[PDB]
Swiss-Prot record, chain A:
Changing residue 291 to A: Does not affect methylation by VCPKMT. Changing residue 366 to H: In IBMPFD1; uncertain significance. Belongs to the AAA ATPase family. This is Transitional endoplasmic reticulum ATPase. The PIM (PUB-interaction motif) motif mediates interaction with the PUB domain of RNF31. The keyword Nucleus applies. It holds the Pfam family AAA_lid_3. It is linked to Inclusion body myopathy with early-onset Paget disease with or without frontotemporal dementia 1: An autosomal dominant disease characterized by disabling muscle weakness clinically resembling to limb girdle muscular dystrophy, osteolytic bone lesions consistent with Paget disease, and premature frontotemporal dementia. Clinical features show incomplete penetrance. Changing residue 292 to A: Does not affect methylation by VCPKMT. Changing residue 134 to S: In IBMPFD1; impaired autophagic function. Keywords: Acetylation, Amyotrophic lateral sclerosis, ATP-binding, Autophagy, Charcot-Marie-Tooth disease, Cytoplasm, Disease variant, DNA damage, DNA repair, Endoplasmic reticulum, Hydrolase, Isopeptide bond, Lipid-binding, Methylation, Neurodegeneration, Neuropathy, Nucleotide-binding, Nucleus, Phosphoprotein, Transport, Ubl conjugation, Ubl conjugation pathway.
């Protein structure tokens, strides 16, 4: 039967769209905009409008949430689709709002909600369905109770709409909305895919795999900083697959007077095991099963042992699945990782860059943003925030917007009419004000992300690009030839050269091109884990790097310890041995199959430990020279993209004139150019202001006080105070080391001996 | 690296269980690599691991002298800087015989080139004598 299709998550959020692949339209002779009739479970029915979309597969149908609840089906089931061309324009429509959606509106719902939603839409509806309308601050659902003709009709301008009456009370099998689905999660695509991979099958079809016989998972650990939304993920999964989500809180089991805590745990487990595909969620696991030495009393030991024995006693059952949420995966008791207990660990990292954009677009759904709002700019500016912080920021912005216009009713016991409340355009000013007075929470957290620097930010280093390409991209692209030819791929690369230049940009660019996460460790951190402890930090950072493969670990300023202990200070050498031994050991213990590179940059190469430069460790050495002439003009071109231009002075002339400079110096010069431009513009504005205060209305209209374009004179002023950052002696020393390492490589070719 | 790590504290335990594990799983050939690293890290601008150095060497020596000939446990130590090793090691009963490994020459070079020449893709290739 080539008519049925399996439902799937959609992208278009309109209430009357479906996404079919073009071969399906070719097979079923389906046009665009036709009316199709959809049959599903429970003998429910609805109509929709076909839209073209190539992303979905041929056997797969994409559809939104309102129609999915209309059909009383969940994702992964089957529906029947057909053309339905006999529908004609309706005559009259009777709609009635739901009781638990309009609490406190008391206004003309027809002019507020129905009129824009039904405008020039031609949305076909069927009697008995429910559709959701976005509005001022809330969402209102209407259940169409009567239409002419029945059951099918199409919206036309000359149709009768009745929106008066006692709101209908909620149904039972309606699958109440406002419950979190898959659209309420953003910035967690990969981890959500991983969770859905191993939980969908044992929950949707429970008997089939058991008949086959496999070991289904019996525990999933979700660990991450608080506020990232782990409970949201668990609740969304439970409400989507179909289960009996039974949360048990952390402190609630500790507040009970001793004896009945174990009784509560036992009752919870025995209740959850009977309701069939159940999903228990132990929130705040570390509160009841902490590290062993933390516990002092005896009730904690009894509670922990009770939990462990219940977990071991869970044998198959009705496919009950337990998930526990913790803060960091080293605080729980180590005994809760044996096989059979919690064994699969899935992390939920802090959203970065784009993820903040999706979170903000999810939260700023109901509110009517003004056209000047740039959500992308706010997302780019704000970092160190988690989901809860963004929600609080949006709420504070809404309240700031609503307070300055408190002349609305302030007296009427009946709540505000939707009319004025729909005339609130939250602007950029409110968002900036709310952002100003808000303290973040993440802050000091290691950031794992994809850097956005392209291979155009740098201009020179043409052959170093080739070397890095060979070292990095090929092993993950064509492993077959490497494994056949016999070589083990290189695991480390060490950079060395004059300070500044472009090491960090090279690392970020290669991480971007290879499309893998980037983790940076600075010298200050190395010394921080050099004056006190030395072991914990290295273990945790390497574990984090390994778990997020692929990634490009970076060790900036590896020579800092050698510089520090090379002076009068001679006591921290033991910790230096500690740090170097940790780095050596957890490079030696890394399996070559895992794709985790290591890159280190040193200003002074000679004084570093020669034990590192051994096979199986950082081996390849790449020399990074000082850019000269032709590279420098590209450096300037890359730097001065900014926003203004320099159409007057020639870049090539200053490239020729400034030979022997590092990139940092050129960026400094370009920055002082902007500083001079800002000074001149601001002093011009001040002069213009005072010349109005001398004579009121001196100029009715203003002019272009110095145009945002960096002139030549600013360039000369900024260039007059120029610096030669590096002296020649370091250049000779680096060249001497280069020729010394090259002198071991000396030989006078061949003649094809013994052909 | 592990030997250098076990200076700072844990200078008794780790040696104890490694020797115990070597003894219980007899026969075995215990291997100590980079034995000169002790005094190599000892010498420098720090001079603070010297107590750690002597304690590690002394647990090694005490456990070595406690061996019994009944168990076939063989100890081999390797180093590349012999002039710096503590002389107390070189006594009868402890590590005594000294064997010098010279650089490969002629037939040794051919043999190692052949040994490294297994691979899957060697094709038919050419002579290795001249290399
Ligand atoms: N896509 C999202 N990602 C992360 N957090 C979100 C997202 N959408 C909403 N949130 C916020 O997460 C909060 C719930 O998370 P919470 O249960 O506190 O996690 P935890 O309890 O682990 O800190 C909600 O109040 C919501 O504002
Ligand atoms: N295309 C480029 N070539 C060389 N240097 C550049 C280029 N673009 C920017 N720079 C400058 O080079 C500097 C790199 O120095 P930095 O990353 O701080 O330390 P490191 O010495 O480890 O690279 C940056 O501050 C940046 O301003």
């Amino acid at each position: 039967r080539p008519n049925r299709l399996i439902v799937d998550e959609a992208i278009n959020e309109d209430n009357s769209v479906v996404s079919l692949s073009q071969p399906k339209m070719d097979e079923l002779q389906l046009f665009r905009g036709d009316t199709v009739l959809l049959k599903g479970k429970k003998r429910r029915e609805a109509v929709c409008i076909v839209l073209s979309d190539d992303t979905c597969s041929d056997e797969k149908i994409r559809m939104n949430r309102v129609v999915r609840n209309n059909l009383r089906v969940r994702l992964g089931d089957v529906i029947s689709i057909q053309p339905c061309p006999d529908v004609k324009y309706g005559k009259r429509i009777h709609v009635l709002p739901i009781d638990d959606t309009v609490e406190g509106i008391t206004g003309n719902l027809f002019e507020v909600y129905l009129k824009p939603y039904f405008l020039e839409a031609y949305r076909p509806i069927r009697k008995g369905d429910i559709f959701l309308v976005r509005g001022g601050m809330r969402a209102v659902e209407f259940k169409v109770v009567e239409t002419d003709p029945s059951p099918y009709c199409i919206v036309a301008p000359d149709t009768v709409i009745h929106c008066e009456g006692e709101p209908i009370k909620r149904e039972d099998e309606e699958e109440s909305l406002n419950e979190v689905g898959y659209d309420d999660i953003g910035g967690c695509r990969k981890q959500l895919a991983q969770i859905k991979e191993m939980v969908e099958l044992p929950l949707r079809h429970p008997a089939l795999f058991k008949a086959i016989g496999v070991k289904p998972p019996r525990g999933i650990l979700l660990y991450g900083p608080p506020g990232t939304g782990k409970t949201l993920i668990a609740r969304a999964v439970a409400n989507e697959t179909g289960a009996f989500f039974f949360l048990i809180n952390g402190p609630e089991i500790m507040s009970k007077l001793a004896g009945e805590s174990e009784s509560n745990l036992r009752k919870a487990f025995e209740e959850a095991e009977k309701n069939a595909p159940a999903i228990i969620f132990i929130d705040e696991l570390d509160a009841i099963a902490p590290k062993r030495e933390k516990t002092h009393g005896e009730v904690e030991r009894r509670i922990v042992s009770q939990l462990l024995t219940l977990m071991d006693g869970l044998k198959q059952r009705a496919h009950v699945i337990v998930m526990a949420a913790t803060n960091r995966p080293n605080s729980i008791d180590p005994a809760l990782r044996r096989f059979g207990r919690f064994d699969r660990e899935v992390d939920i990292g802090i959203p970065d860059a784009t993820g903040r954009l999706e979170i903000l677009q999810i939260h700023t759904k109901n509110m009517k943003l003004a056209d000047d709002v740039d959500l992308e700019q706010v997302a780019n500016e704000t970092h160190g925030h988690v989901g809860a912080d963004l929600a609080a920021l949006c709420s504070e912005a809404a309240l700031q917007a609503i307070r300055k216009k408190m002349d609305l009713i302030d007296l009427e016991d009946e709540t505000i009419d939707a009319e004025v409340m729909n005339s609130l355009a939250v602007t950029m000013d409110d968002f900036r004000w709310a952002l100003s007075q808000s303290n973040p929470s993440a802050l000091r957290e290691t950031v794992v992300e994809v850097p956005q620097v392209t291979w155009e930010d740098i201009g020179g280093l043409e052959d170093v690009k080739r070397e890095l390409q060979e070292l990095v991209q090929y092993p993950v692209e064509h492993p077959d030839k490497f494994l056949k030819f016999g070589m083990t791929p290189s695991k480390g690369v060490l950079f060395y050269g004059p300070p500044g230049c472009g090491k960090t940009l090279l690392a970020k660019a290669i991480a971007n091109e290879c499309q893998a996460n980037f983790i940076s460790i600075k010298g200050p951190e190395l010394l921080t884990m050099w004056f006190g402890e030395s072991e914990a930090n290295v273990r945790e950072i390497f574990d984090k790097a390994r778990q997020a493969a692929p990634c490009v670990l970076f060790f900036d300023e590896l020579d800092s310890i050698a510089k520090a202990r090379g002076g009068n200070i001679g006591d921290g050498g033991g910790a230096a041995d500690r740090v170097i031994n940790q780095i050596l050991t957890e490079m030696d213990g890394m399996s070559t199959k895992k794709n985790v590179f290591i890159i280190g940059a040193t200003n002074r190469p000679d004084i570093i430990d020669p034990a590192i430069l051994r096979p199986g460790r950082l081996d390849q050495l790449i020399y990074i020279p000082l850019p000269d002439e032709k590279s420098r003009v590209a450096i300037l071109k890359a730097n001065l993209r900014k926003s203004p231009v320099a159409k007057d002075v020639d870049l090539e002339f200053l490239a020729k004139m400034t030979n022997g400079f590092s990139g940092a110096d050129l960026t400094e010069i370009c920055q002082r150019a902007c500083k001079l431009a800002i000074r001149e513009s601001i002093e011009s504005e001040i002069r213009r202001e005072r010349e109005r205060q001398t004579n009121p209305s001196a100029m009715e209209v203003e002019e272009d006080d110095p145009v945002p374009e960096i002139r030549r004179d600013h360039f000369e002023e900024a260039m007059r105070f120029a610096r030669r950052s590096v002296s020649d002696n370091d250049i000779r020393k680096y060249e001497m080391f280069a020729q010394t390492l090259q002198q071991s490589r000396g030989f006078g070719s061949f003649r094809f001996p013994s052909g």
